Design an enzyme around this catalytic site. Structure first.
Site, PDB file in Angstrom:
ATOM      1  N   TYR E  26       0.828  -1.342   0.110  1.00 32.22           N
ATOM      2  CA  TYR E  26      -0.134  -0.026   0.164  1.00 32.22           C
ATOM      3  C   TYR E  26       0.935   1.395   0.098  1.00 32.22           C
ATOM      4  CZ  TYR E  26       1.047   0.405   4.995  1.00 32.22           C
ATOM      5  OH  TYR E  26       1.676   0.326   6.052  1.00 32.22           O
ATOM      6  N   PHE E  36       2.748  10.301   2.119  1.00 31.77           N
ATOM      7  CA  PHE E  36       3.683  10.235   3.216  1.00 31.77           C
ATOM      8  C   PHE E  36       4.028   8.811   3.324  1.00 31.77           C
ATOM      9  CE2 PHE E  36      -0.818   9.376   4.385  1.00 31.77           C
ATOM     10  CZ  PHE E  36      -0.714   8.273   5.296  1.00 31.77           C
ATOM     11  N   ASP E  37       3.763   8.013   2.531  1.00 30.71           N
ATOM     12  CA  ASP E  37       3.803   6.596   3.060  1.00 30.71           C
ATOM     13  C   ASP E  37       3.988   5.824   1.771  1.00 30.71           C
ATOM     14  OD1 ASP E  37       4.656   4.240   4.048  1.00 30.71           O
ATOM     15  OD2 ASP E  37       2.717   4.207   5.286  1.00 30.71           O
ATOM     16  N   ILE E  56      -5.087   1.096  12.499  1.00 33.05           N
ATOM     17  CA  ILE E  56      -6.144   1.898  12.526  1.00 33.05           C
ATOM     18  C   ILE E  56      -7.508   1.230  12.370  1.00 33.05           C
ATOM     19  CG2 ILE E  56      -4.618   4.090  11.967  1.00 33.05           C
ATOM     20  CD1 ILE E  56      -5.579   4.231   9.237  1.00 33.05           C
ATOM     21  N   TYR E  82      -6.361   8.678  12.674  1.00 32.19           N
ATOM     22  CA  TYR E  82      -5.797   9.528  13.677  1.00 32.19           C
ATOM     23  C   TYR E  82      -6.703  10.325  14.247  1.00 32.19           C
ATOM     24  CZ  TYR E  82      -1.560   6.697  12.204  1.00 32.19           C
ATOM     25  OH  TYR E  82      -0.611   5.887  11.797  1.00 32.19           O
ATOM     26  N   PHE E  99      -5.226   5.997   0.586  1.00 32.76           N
ATOM     27  CA  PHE E  99      -4.294   4.521   0.275  1.00 32.76           C
ATOM     28  C   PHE E  99      -4.498   3.958  -1.028  1.00 32.76           C
ATOM     29  CE2 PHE E  99      -4.267   3.920   5.239  1.00 32.76           C
ATOM     30  CZ  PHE E  99      -3.220   4.640   5.399  1.00 32.76           C
TER      31      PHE E  99
END
Lengths: 377, 81, 275, 541, 107, 457
Positions: E26, E36-37, E56, E82, E99
C-alpha cells in the site's frame, strides 16, 4: 587470589614455559602499513585539520604501543560464565538505554532501565564487571546532569545499593564524596552515607574538607528538615562499626563547636507539640553519642549532666523511642550506681511494653536492645 | 574641553591627551608619505595619535565658512594626519 | 570457580608479566617522526600546542597528550669521554625536541593548566625536565625568549597556584595512615632547571617577570612552600619526639619530605647560584 | 555606593579607578606620596568624593570640588615639595607597595564598614588593612571602559530623547549610528583566515570585551534602545526617523555581536528569549534579529530548555514569512542540539510544528519517468481511434505504471520527461484530455475526478481504449472495450490540432488501433487512419 | 465515515477473516495528495494480523471488503485513522488518509 | 504600506507582463488591484505555461448517469478574467470567487474549485507609469500559516514573479528505451528509470534534484534541510526518526547512494541521513559497548590462538555487546529498520565504484569533488562496519581494497584520510579486540590447567 599471583610469579610447575610461549605470542602485517602511511601523511603535506591530527597520532600512538594498549584494555575486560551470559545481554542493552540518556518522558525510561539492572542476576555475582563498565560513574554523572526529580531518587537508590553490594566497589563511590556533597544542596546524602558505612578504611581515608562542607550545610540550617539528614551522615561517618574512630570524631567535634548554629527548653517545647526539630536534637545528641589529649572532647560533650531530664520528659511524652534512645546512648558513652538508681523511669516503659496488643511495639524493641546499657531503695 | 575652572568642575582629562607617535620635517615626510624619541623641531610636521581611541588626528573634508572640520581618522595614511 | 579465577588471573597478570618493557620503542618511534615544511613530530608538538592555546579554561584529560608527552619524556679516561659523549647524545635528543618547538608546547601547556593539578601538568613538567635535565642552555633561551615575546603572564600564575597547592608532609593524615611528592619535586626540579646553567636574565625574570601586567615573584613562593614544608617537618618531629624508634611508614614518608626539601633548597640554590 | 569586593569582580570594568592629579599639566608624572589628586571612576565617569549629605560617595564631576574629593597616599598613618614641573622621582610600584589612602581635607583614612559586599567608609583610624596596593589595568580594558562611558552617555541621551517624543506625537542621530558602527567594528570577530595563536588571543580579548560591556549593563542598554525602537514601523521629524531602519538594524547587529563569543552573554537572554522571538517577525530588520537568535542558541545550552511551542511556532512561521532561508534552518538545528547533548522535547516540537504539514520546505521522493508517444497524425469532421493494451506490470519499481490515453492540442502540451507539474505525469496541462489507469475516469489539470463506469476496471494487458472526439462540437468520451464510460469532457478550446497521446511508464507494450481495428463502432465518427492522409507516412514519434 | 473505493478486481471470493495474517502492499498520501507513505518504497510486503487492532480501525474494516489480489483505494475517515491526534510528525490532526492498497494474500 | 505597491515601465519596450504572484491559496479575503491606466486581473492555477496575448482564456467537466443527463457540472479553471483614470478590481474569496470592479459587485464569473491552489495574478500589457497596485479580512490573514490574524502584515515572501517564457532545465541522463513495431503500430518499452525528484509545495511544480545543482541557492537550502533532518535524529531520537522515514523514504536513500550525478553537499547530506534516520543510534550504542571488551567462556570463544595456524579480518568475533534491534517503520497504528544485508553490499559496491575509477584518476569527480566522492562513503562504510555488520569475508574485501594484501596508497584530500583514519582505527580496535579476547581464552585454558594443579596440593 594472592596465591594465584604467586602462581603468576613464574617469570623469576612446567606450565610456566607454556606461559612463556604465550607471552612470546603476545609480543605480536597491519602495523607496518599503518605506521608508515601515517608517517607519509605527516611528511607529505603539513596537515591542518586538528581532528585529523588527533586521529593520526592516536593511531600512530597505539601502533607502537603494542603492550600498553592491552594494559589499558584489560581492566575494562572481564570474563563471564557461559551459563549467565543472557542476563548481560539484558543488562548492557538496558545500560545502553542510560548511555543515550546520559546525553540529553525519558525519566520513566531511566527508572525502568535502572530497575531492570536492579533485577539482574548478573549484578550480585560479578561486581568487578559492574565497576569495569564504569556504569556507576555513569549513573552519578546523569544524576549530576539533572541537578543544578523522582528519577534522581531512583539513581540514589541504585547508587546506595551499589554501595551495598561490596566494599572494594564501595571505594569507587568513595572517590566522589566531595563531589556528591557539592551536589547536595537539599537522597544523595544517603548515597554518600552508604559510601562511608561498612569500611573503616574509607571512614578514615576521608578528608576533613567533606565534613567541613557538611557542617557548612548545618550552618545553612539557621531556621530544619535537612539537619537530621546531615547529622545522620555524620553518624555513619564517625561511628563506623561500633568503634568510635578518634580521627573522624575529633574533627567533627571541633567543627561542630564553631557553627552550632536554653535549647533544652526548645526540646521540651518540641515534646509539648515540628517533629524535625526534636529529630534534630535527637540526631545531634546521637552524633555526640557516637563520639568519645582525646579526653577533652568528652568534657566538651559534658558541657552539653544536661541530659537525663530529656529521657524522663520523653518517658512522660507517650515519637519518644528514638529521641530517648539517643539521649541514652549519649548518656552512656559520655557518662555511679546511685545515679543509675536516680535514672530509674525505664521500669515505667517496661510496664508500657505490654500494650503491644503500634509505635510502642517498636519502642519495646529499641529499649530491650538498649536494656543492655543499664547492666553496666 | 575647558580647564580654567580647575576647582569645582574638573576637565575630562582622560581624552585630552595626544601621544606623539612620530614627527618629521616637511620634505622628510613626503618620502614616507610617497612610500626612538627624536625631539620635535619647529617647522616639522607631527603626527597626533590620540591616547584613548588611538585614532590619528587629522584635518577632514566635511564642513560644519569654508573652514574644514577637525577629526580623528583611523589610519596614518594620507597627508591629513 | 571458573570465571572467578580467570578474572583474578587476568588481573594479576596485568600487574605481572605485562611489565616487562616493550617501552624501548619510544625512541624508535620518535626517530621515525624526524625524517623529512614541518616534520611529523613538529606536527605533533604544534597540534598539542594549539590545543593548549585554546580557551578550554578547564583542560580535559587528553589521553593523547599524556601519551606523547610521556613518550618524549622517555626519549631522553674512557669514562670521561663516554660521559660527555652521553652529554652530546642527550643534547641531541633535546635538539630533536626544542628545535621543533617543544619547549613552547611545554610552557603553554603549563600555563594553560592554571591551578589544576591533573595528570596533565605532571606529564608536562616531566616533559620539561626531559627537555632540560642537563641544564640545557638553548632551551632556556627559547623559553625565556618565548615568555618575553608572548607575554602570556599566566604561566607564573599557574605555577604560583601550583605551589599554593602542592603537598606537605602533613600530620593528621599520617595518623589516618597509621591506623603526593613526585609532582612537587618535578616542579621544583623544573624551575631549578630553568635556572641551572646560571642564566642571569632568566633568574631575574623569575624575580619579577618584567613586562607582564601582573608581576609575580616566584622565589618568594618557593620559599613559602619551603616554609610550610618546614612546619610540616617540625610537626612531624614533635610527633615522633617521644616514640624514639621510628615506624617504617614514618621513615618512607619522611624520606619523602626530605627528598622534597632537598629539591627545593636546591631550587633555591639555582635561584641564587650566580652572583 | 562604594564596596570592597573579592572573588569575581577584579575583572569587572566597574572595579577600575583613574588617578587624576589637580595640575592640568604633567599628569603622567610619577606618583609621589602626598600629592593632591582627584580619583575618578572609569565607567560612570563620576569622581569619588566626601560629602556632608551622605558621607563617602561617588558623585558627578560638577559636584566634586577639590578638597571634598581629593585623596593622597601615605606609607603609614602619620599625619606629617611644591609641585615640580618634572616627572618627579620614581615611587609606587603596583607590586611592592602597600599604599595607605587618605582624604586631603577631613584627613579621614579609607577603611570599611561591617554575603561579600563589604562597604567602604572613611574614618580617622580604621582597620589595619587600609593600605590597598594599586594594580595597573590593561590599556585595552581601559580603552574599553572609557568607551563604555561615552557609549553609556550617548545611549542614555538617546533613550531620554526617545521618551521625549514617545507618547506625544506631533536629539542625536548620526552620532549614534557612527557609534554603533565603530562598536560593531570594535567587536568584529577575528577572521577565520588567520593563524591559530593570534586568533585565539584576539578571541580571548573579544571575550573580555563582550564581557566588560555586559558587566556594565551596556547589553541591557542597547536592549532598551531596541525595545524603545520597536514601537514604530515607520513622532520624529522626516529626517531623524528617516534613518531609523539603519539604526535598528545596526542595533541588532551590535546586539548579535556581543553574544557571538561568550556563553554567559547569551545566558542572560534566558528571560529575553520570548522578546527575541516576539520581535523576530518584525519584517524590517529581520536578518539582524535572526542572527541574534542564532548566535544565542549555538552557545547557550541553558537557553534551550526555556523555549516553548509558541517560539518555534513563530520561528517556523517566520520561515513562512520570509520565503526560504537556510539561516532559519540552522537556527532550528541549533534548537535541536546544545553543545552536544540533545533536547528531546524541542526536537519533537520542531518536528510537529514543521514536518507533518509538508507545505513549506522542499519535499522529495523518487519518481519513475513519464513518457508518451504520438502516432504522427495531426487531427483538427469528428475523429475516432482505439488503443489496445498488451503489457503492463502495474506495480514494478514503486509507482503504478500510468497508461493514460487521450487527446492534446499541438499549441501547448509539452511533455518534457520530468520534471514539471505536480510530480510530472499525463493530464497536468489543461490542453490534455487523457483516460484510463486509476479508476479509469479523467485527468485534466492533473486532477483525478472519478467518473463512474459499468465495471471501473483498470487497464490490463487485454483492454482496448475506445477514444472519441468531435469537430465543432466539443464533446469528448472514451470507452473500455466498447462499454460506455458516461459523458465526460465538454466545452473546450478548438485551436491547433489535437493528437492521440497514449502515456506510459516503465515496461509497457501497447498496440495502437488506427488502421487494423480489433474493434470499431460507428459512433463519432471517422477512423483515425484516414487522418494520415496529407503526405507524411504514419509513424509514431 | 470510512469511504473505501475499489480500484481493480482480485479473485473476488476470498475475503479476510478474524486473526488472519493479511499480506499487502500500500501507499499513503494526504487529501492534498502529498505522499507520506509507501510500502513499495520499502520494497517489502506488509503483513498484519486482522482484528488484532494493531492498525487504525479504518484499515481494519476497509481491508475486509477487499479480496485476495485486489487493488483498492481507501479514503479512511480520520476518526478511524488518527482523528484529533494525528500521528505525530507525519499526519496532521483531522486528516483523511488516501491509500492505494493491494491485498497480496491472506494467511 | 494601507498595503499596496507602486510600479512603472521606464523603457522603450512595453511588450508583455504576467504578474503571477507567489502565494497560492487553498480552501472574506479581499484582493484589490488598483490601476492608474484594459487589465486582466485573475486568480491562476499554478500550472500555466502560455506566453501569448491571445486572451480569452484557454474547460467544463461532466459526469453521466449511465444514460447522460445532469449531476455533471464542475469547474473551468485554467483561470480568472477582467477587462479615464483610476480602476479597482478586487478578487474576494471564501467556496466561491467573487469579483467587484470599481467596488461594484459585477461577479457571476468563474468560481468553482473543490480544494486546489490559486496564485493571485494580474496579466497586463503596460500603459507606462504606475501600471498596477494591490492590497472583509485581509488576504495576508489567509495566505500565511498563523491564520486568522485579521490585521494586514505585508510579507517578504510577497514576491511578484513574471512568467518568464524560457527558463532552462535538465537534459536528463539515461532515459526510456523507446520502441514501436510497425506490426499494428505496437509501441513498446522495458527497463524503468527514476528521477531523484522533488516539488516546491509553496508554489507547486516538479523538478529533479539532478537539475538542482545549477540552482545552488536551492541546494543550499535543501542540504541544510538535510542538516536539519540529520540533526533531529541525534542520539536515539527514534520517535521522530519514524517520521523522517516518512519524509525521506528508504529507497530514496538507496538511489541517493546510487547516482553520481547528485551534487556534493546534497550527497553528503543523504549519506549522513543514512547515518541518522537509521544507522546512527545503533552504532552509538555499539561504541562504548564495543570498548567494554567483556567475554563469555563458551567453546567458540575458547580457541582463540591469537596467531592463526596474522590478520585483522579474523572471524572469531566472540565477546557479548548486545545486538542492535530494529522495529520496522509503519504508520498503521522506537528503532527504524533497513535492508542491512543489501545495504552493506551496496556500500562495498560504492567503495569499488569509486576506488576503481578514482584510481584511474578521473575528474568528474562524482560529487563535484573527491571529498564528496569518498568521505560520505567511507563514513557510511565506517559506521556500518562498526555496527558489526559485514561478514568478515567482505572485510577481507575491504583489506584487499586498502592494504592490498587501490585506495590507501592514493593521494587524498584531508577529510577523506580523516574518515579513512577513523575506519582504519576501527581495524586497529579490532586488533585490540582479537588480542584481549585471545588473552581471555588463554586465561580460561590456563585457569583449567592451574585449577587442575590446585587439587594436587
Amino acid at each position: 587470589q594472592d596465591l594465584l599471583a604467586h602462581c603468576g610469579i613464574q617469570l623469576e610447575t612446567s606450565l610456566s614455559s607454556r606461559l612463556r610461549s604465550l607471552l612470546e605470542t603476545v609480543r605480536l602485517s597491519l602495523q607496518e602499513l599503518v605506521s608508515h602511511m601515517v608517517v607519509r601523511w605527516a611528511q607529505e603535506d603539513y596537515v591542518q585539520s586538528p581532528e585529523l591530527v588527533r586521529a593520526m597520532f592516536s593511531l600512530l600512538h597505539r601502533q607502537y604501543d603494542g603492550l600498553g594498549e592491552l594494559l589499558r584494555a584489560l581492566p575494562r575486560a572481564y570474563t563471564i560464565s557461559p551459563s549467565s551470559v543472557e542476563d548481560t545481554m539484558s543488562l548492557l542493552e538496558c545500560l545502553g538505554q542510560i548511555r543515550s540518556l546520559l546525553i540529553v518522558q525519558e525519566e520513566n525510561l531511566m527508572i525502568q532501565s535502572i530497575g531492570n539492572i536492579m533485577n539482574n542476576k548478573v549484578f550480585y555475582q560479578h561486581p568487578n564487571l559492574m565497576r569495569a563498565l564504569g556504569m556507576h560513574e555513569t549513573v552519578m554523572e546523569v544524576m549530576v546532569n539533572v541537578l543544578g526529580p523522582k528519577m534522581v531518587t531512583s539513581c540514589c537508590r541504585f547508587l546506595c545499593y551499589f554501595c551495598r553490594i561490596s566494599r572494594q566497589n564501595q571505594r569507587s563511590m568513595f572517590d566522589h564524596l566531595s563531589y556528591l556533597l557539592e551536589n547536595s544542596g537539599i537522597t544523595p546524602l544517603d548515597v554518600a552515607a552508604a559510601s562511608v558505612i561498612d569500611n573503616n578504611e574509607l571512614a578514615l581515608a576521608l578528608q576533613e574538607q567533606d565534613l567541613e562542607k557538611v557542617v557548612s550545610y548545618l550552618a545553612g540550617c539557621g531556621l530544619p528538615c535537612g539537619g537530621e539528614r546531615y547529622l545522620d551522615f555524620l553518624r555513619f561517618a564517625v561511628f563506623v562499626n561500633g568503634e568510635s574512630v578518634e580521627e573522624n570524631a575529633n574533627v567533627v567535634v571541633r567543627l561542630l563547636i564553631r557553627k552550632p548554629e536554653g535549647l533544652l527548653a526548645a526540646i521540651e517545647e518540641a515534646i509539648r507539640i515540628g517533629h524535625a526539630i526534636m529529630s534534630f536534637y535527637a540526631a545531634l545528641i546521637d552524633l555526640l553519642g557516637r563520639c568519645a589529649e582525646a579526653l577533652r572532647i568528652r568534657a566538651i560533650l559534658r558541657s552539653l549532666l544536661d541530659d537525663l531530664v530529656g529521657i524522663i520528659s520523653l518517658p512522660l511524652q507517650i515519637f519518644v523511642p528514638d529521641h530517648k534512645a539517643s539521649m541514652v546512648l549519649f548518656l552512656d558513652r559520655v557518662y555511679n550506681q546511685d545515679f543509675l538508681l536516680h535514672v530509674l523511669v525505664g521500669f515505667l516503659p517496661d510496664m508500657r511494653a505490654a500494650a503491644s496488643l503500634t509505635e510502642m511495639a517498636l519502642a519495646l524493641n529499641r529499649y530491650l536492645c538498649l536494656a543492655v546499657l543499664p547492666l553496666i531503695p | 574641553e575647558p580647564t580654567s575652572n580647575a576647582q569645582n568642575v574638573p576637565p575630562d582629562l582622560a581624552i585630552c591627551c595626544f601621544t606623539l607617535e612620530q614627527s618629521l620635517s616637511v620634505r622628510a615626510l613626503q618620502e614616507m608619505l610617497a612610500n626612538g624619541h627624536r625631539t620635535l623641531l619647529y617647522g616639522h610636521a607631527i603626527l597626533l595619535r590620540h591616547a584613548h581611541s588611538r585614532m590619528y588626528l587629522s584635518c577632514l573634508t566635511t564642513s560644519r565658512k569654508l573652514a574644514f572640520d577637525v577629526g580623528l581618522q583611523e589610519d596614518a595614511t594620507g597627508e591629513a594626519c | 570457580p571458573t570465571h572467578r579465577a580467570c578474572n583474578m588471573f587476568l588481573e594479576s597478570y596485568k600487574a605481572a608479566w605485562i611489565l616487562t618493557e616493550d617501552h624501548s620503542f619510544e625512541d624508535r618511534m620518535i626517530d621515525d617522526l624526524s625524517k623529512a615544511k614541518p616534520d611529523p613530530l613538529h606536527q605533533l608538538v604544534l597540534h598539542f600546542s594549539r590545543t593548549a592555546l585554546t580557551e578550554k579554561s578547564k583542560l580535559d584529560e587528553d589521553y593523547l597528550y599524556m601519551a606523547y608527552a610521556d613518550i618524549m619524556a622517555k626519549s631522553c679516561e674512557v669514562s670521561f669521554e663516554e660521559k660527555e659523549m652521553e652529554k652530546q647524545r642527550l643534547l641531541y635528543q633535546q635538539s630533536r625536541l626544542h628545535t621543533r618547538g617543544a619547549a613552547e608546547m611545554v610552557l603553554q601547556m603549563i600555563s594553560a593548566c592554571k591551578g589544576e593539578t591533573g595528570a596533565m601538568v605532571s606529564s608536562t613538567l616531566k616533559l620539561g625536565i626531559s627537555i632540560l635535565n642537563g641544564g640545557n642552555a638553548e632551551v632556556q633561551q627559547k623559553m625565556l625568549d618565548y615568555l618575553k615575546d608572548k607575554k602570556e603572564v599566566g604561566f607564573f600564575q599557574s605555577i604560583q597556584a601550583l605551589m599554593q597547592t602542592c603537598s606537605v608532609l602533613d600530620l593528621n593524615a599520617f595518623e589516618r595512615q597509621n591506623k603526593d611528592d613526585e609532582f612537587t619535586q618535578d616542579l621544583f626540579r623544573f624551575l631549578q632547571l630553568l635556572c641551572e646553567g646560571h642564566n642571569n636574565d632568566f633568574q631575574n625574570y623569575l624575580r619579577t617577570q618584567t613586562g607582564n601586567t601582573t608581576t609575580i615573584n616566584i622565589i618568594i613562593c618557593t620559599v613559602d612552600y619551603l616554609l610550610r614544608l618546614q612546619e610540616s617537618i617540625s610537626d612531624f618531629y614533635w610527633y615522633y619526639s617521644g616514640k624514639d624508634v621510628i615506624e617504617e611508614q614514618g621513615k618512607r614518608n619522611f624520606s619523602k619530605a626530605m627528598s622534597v626539601a632537598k629539591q627545593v633548597f636546591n631550587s633555591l640554590t639555582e635561584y641564587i647560584q650566580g652572583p | 555606593l562604594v564596596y570592597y569586593e573579592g572573588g569575581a569582580v577584579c575583572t569587572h570594568a566597574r572595579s577600575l579607578w583613574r588617578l587624576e592629579p589637580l595640575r592640568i599639566s604633567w599628569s603622567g608624572s610619577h606618583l609621589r606620596w602626598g600629592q593632591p589628586l582627584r580619583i575618578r571612576h572609569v565607567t560612570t565617569g563620576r569622581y569619588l568624593a566626601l560629602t556632608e549629605d551622605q558621607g563617602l560617595v561617588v558623585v558627578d564631576a560638577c559636584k566634586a570640588h577639590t578638597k571634598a574629593t581629593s585623596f593622597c597616599f601615605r606609607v603609614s598613618k602619620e599625619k606629617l615639595k611644591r609641585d615640580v614641573e618634572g616627572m618627579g622621582p620614581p615611587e609606587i610600584k603596583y607590586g611592592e607597595s602597600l599604599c595607605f589612602v587618605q582624604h586631603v581635607a577631613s584627613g579621614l583614612w579609607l577603611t570599611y564598614a561591617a554575603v561579600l559586599k563589604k562597604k567602604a567608609i572613611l574614618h580617622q583610624e580604621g582597620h589595619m588593612d587600609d593600605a590597598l596596593f594599586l594594580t595597573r589595568c590593561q590599556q585595552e580594558e581601559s580603552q574599553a571602559a572609557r568607551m563604555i562611558h561615552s557609549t553609556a552617555g550617548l545611549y542614555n541621551q538617546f533613550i531620554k530623547g526617545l521618551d521625549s517624543f514617545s507618547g506625544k506625537p506631533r536629539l542625536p542621530i548620526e552620532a549614534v549610528i557612527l557609534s554603533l558602527q565603530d562598536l560593531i567594528g570594535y567587536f568584529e570577530p577575528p577572521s577565520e583566515e588567520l593563524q591559530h595563536e593570534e586568533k585565539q588571543s584576539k578571541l580571548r580579548s573579544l571575550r573580555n570585551r563582550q564581557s566588560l560591556f555586559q558587566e556594565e549593563g551596556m547589553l541591557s542598554l542597547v536592549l532598551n534602545c531596541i525595545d524603545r525602537l520597536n514601537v514604530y514601523t515607520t513622532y520624529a521629524g522626516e529626517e531623524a526617523a528617516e534613518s531609523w531602519k539603519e539604526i535598528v538594524n545596526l542595533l541588532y547587529e551590535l546586539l548579535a555581536s556581543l553574544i557571538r563569543g561568550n556563553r554567559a552573554n547569551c545566558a542572560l537572554f534566558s528571560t529575553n528569549l520570548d522578546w527575541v522571538v516576539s520581535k523576530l517577525d518584525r519584517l524590517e530588520a529581520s536578518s539582524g534579529i535572526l542572527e541574534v537568535l542564532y548566535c544565542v542558541l549555538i552557545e547557550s545550552p541553558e537557553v534551550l530548555n526555556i523555549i516553548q511551542e509558541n517560539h518555534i511556532k513563530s520561528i517556523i512561521s517566520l520561515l513562512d514569512k520570509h520565503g526560504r532561508n537556510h539561516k532559519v534552518l540552522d537556527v532550528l538545528c541549533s534548537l535541536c542540539v546544545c553543545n552536544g547533548v540533545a533536547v528531546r522535547s524541542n526536537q519533537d516540537l520542531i518536528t510537529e510544528n514543521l514536518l507533518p504539514g509538508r507545505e513549506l520546505l522542499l519535499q522529495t521522493n523518487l519518481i519513475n519517468y513519464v513518457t508518451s508517444i504520438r502516432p504522427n497524425i495531426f487531427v483538427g469532421g469528428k475523429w475516432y481511434f482505439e488503443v489496445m493494451v498488451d503489457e503492463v506490470v502495474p506495480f514494478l519499481t514503486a509507482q503504478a505504471t500510468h497508461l493514460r490515453v487521450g487527446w492534446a492540442l499541438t499549441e501547448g502540451y509539452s511533455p518534457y520527461p520530468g520534471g514539471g507539474e505536480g510530480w510530472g505525469g499525463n493530464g497536468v496541462g489543461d490542453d490534455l484530455y487523457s483516460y484510463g489507469f486509476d479508476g479509469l475516469h479523467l485527468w485534466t489539470g492533473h486532477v483525478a475526478r472519478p467518473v463512474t463506469s459499468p465495471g471501473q476496471h483498470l487497464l490490463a494487458p487485454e483492454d482496448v481504449v475506445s477514444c472519441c472526439l468531435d469537430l465543432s462540437v466539443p464533446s469528448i468520451s472514451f470507452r473500455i472495450n466498447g462499454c460506455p464510460v458516461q459523458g465526460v469532457f465538454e466545452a473546450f478550446n478548438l485551436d491547433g490540432l489535437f493528437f492521440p497521446v497514449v502515456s506510459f511508464s516503465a515496461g509497457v507494450k501497447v498496440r495502437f488501433l488506427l488502421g487494423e481495428f480489433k474493434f470499431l463502432p460507428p459512433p463519432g465518427y471517422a477512423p483515425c487512419h484516414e487522418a494520415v492522409l496529407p503526405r507524411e507516412r504514419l509513424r509514431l514519434e | 465515515g470510512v469511504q473505501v473505493e475499489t480500484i481493480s478486481p482480485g479473485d473476488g471470493r476470498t475475503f479476510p477473516k478474524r486473526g488472519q495474517t493479511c499480506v499487502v502492499h500500500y501507499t499513503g498520501m494526504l487529501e492534498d495528495g502529498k505522499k507520506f507513505d509507501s510500502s513499495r518504497d520499502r520494497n517489502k510486503p506488509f503483513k498484519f494480523m486482522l482484528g488484532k487492532q494493531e492498525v487504525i480501525r479504518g484499515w481494519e474494516e476497509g481491508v475486509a471488503q477487499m479480496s485476495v489480489g485486489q487493488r483498492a483505494k481507501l479514503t479512511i475517515s480520520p476518526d478511524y485513522a488518527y482523528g484529533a491526534t494525528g500521528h505525530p510528525g507525519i499526519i496532521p490532526p483531522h486528516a483523511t488518509l488516501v491509500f492505494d492498497v493491494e491485498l497480496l494474500k491472506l494467511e | 504600506d494601507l498595503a499596496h505597491r507602486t510600479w512603472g515601465s521606464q523603457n522603450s519596450l512595453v511588450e508583455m507582463l504576467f504578474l503571477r504572484l507567489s502565494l497560492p491559496v487553498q480552501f472574506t479575503y479581499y484582493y484589490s488591484v488598483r490601476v492608474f491606466a484594459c487589465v486582466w486581473v485573475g486568480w491562476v492555477t499554478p500550472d500555466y505555461h502560455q506566453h501569448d496575448m491571445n486572451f480569452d482564456l484557454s474547460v467544463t467537466v461532466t459526469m453521466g448517469d449511465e444514460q447522460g443527463n445532469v449531476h455533471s457540472s464542475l469547474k473551468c479553471s485554467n483561470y480568472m478574467v477582467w477587462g479615464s483614470h483610476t480602476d479597482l478590481v478586487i478578487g474576494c474569496l471564501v467556496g466561491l470567487m467573487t469579483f467587484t470592479a470599481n467596488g461594484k459587485e459585477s461577479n457571476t464569473f468563474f468560481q468553482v474549485e473543490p480544494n486546489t491552489k490559486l496564485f493571485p495574478a494580474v496579466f497586463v500589457l503596460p500603459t507606462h507609469q504606475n501600471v498596477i497596485q494591490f492590497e472583509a479580512a485581509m488576504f495576508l490573514s489567509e495566505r500565511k500559516n498563523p491564520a486568522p490574524q485579521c490585521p494586514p502584515r505585508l510579507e517578504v515572501q510577497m514576491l511578484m514573479p513574471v512568467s518568464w517564457s524560457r527558463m532552462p532545465n535538465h537534459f536528463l541522463q539515461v532515459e526510456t528505451r523507446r520502441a514501436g513495431e510497425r506490426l499494428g503500430w505496437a509501441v513498446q518499452c522495458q527497463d524503468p528509470l527514476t528521477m531523484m525528484a522533488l516539488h516546491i509545495p509553496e508554489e507547486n511544480r516538479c523538478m529533479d534534484i539532478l537539475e538542482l545543482s545549477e540552482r545552488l541557492d536551492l541546494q543550499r537550502f535543501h542540504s541544510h534541510t538535510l542538516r536539519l533532518y540529520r540533526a533531529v535524529c541525534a542520539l536515539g531520537n527514534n520517535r521522530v526518526a519514524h517520521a523522517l522515514c516518512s519524509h525521506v523514504d528508504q529507497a530514496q536513500l538507496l538511489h541517493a547512494l546510487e547516482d553520481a550525478h547528485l551534487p556534493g553537499p546534497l550527497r553528503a547530506g543523504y549519506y549522513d541521513l543514512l547515518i541518522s534516520i537509521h544507522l546512527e543510534s545503533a552504532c552509538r550504542s555499539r561504541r562504548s559497548m564495543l570498548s567494554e571488551y567483556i567475554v563469555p567462556l563458551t567453546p567458540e570463544t575458547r580457541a582463540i590462538t591469537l596467531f592463526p595456524p596474522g590478520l585483522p579480518g579474523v572471524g572469531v568475533t566472540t565477546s557479548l555487546r548486545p545486538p542492535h534491534h530494529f522495529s520496522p517503520p509503519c504508520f498503521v497504528a522506537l528503532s527504524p529498520a533497513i535492508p542491512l544485508e543489501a545495504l552493506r553490499d551496496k556500500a562495498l559496491r560504492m567503495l569499488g565504484e569509486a576506488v576503481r575509477d578514482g584510481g584511474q584518476h578521473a575528474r568528474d569527480p562524482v560529487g563535484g569533488s573527491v571529498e564528496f566522492q569518498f568521505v560520505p562513503v567511507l563514513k557510511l562504510v565506517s559506521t556500518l562496519l562498526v555496527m558489526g555488520i559485514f561478514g568478515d569475508e567482505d572485510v577481507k574485501q575491504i583489506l584487499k581494497m586498502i592494504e592490498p594484501e587501490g585506495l590507501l596508497q592514493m593521494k587524498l584530500p584531508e577529510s577523506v584520510k580523516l574518515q579513512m583514519c577513523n575506519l582504519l582505527e576501527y581495524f586497529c580496535d579490532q586488533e585490540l579486540q582479537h588480542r584481549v579476547e585471545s588473552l581471555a581464552a588463554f586465561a580460561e585454558r590456563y585457569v583449567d590447567k592451574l585449577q587442575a594443579n590446585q587439587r594436587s596440593r
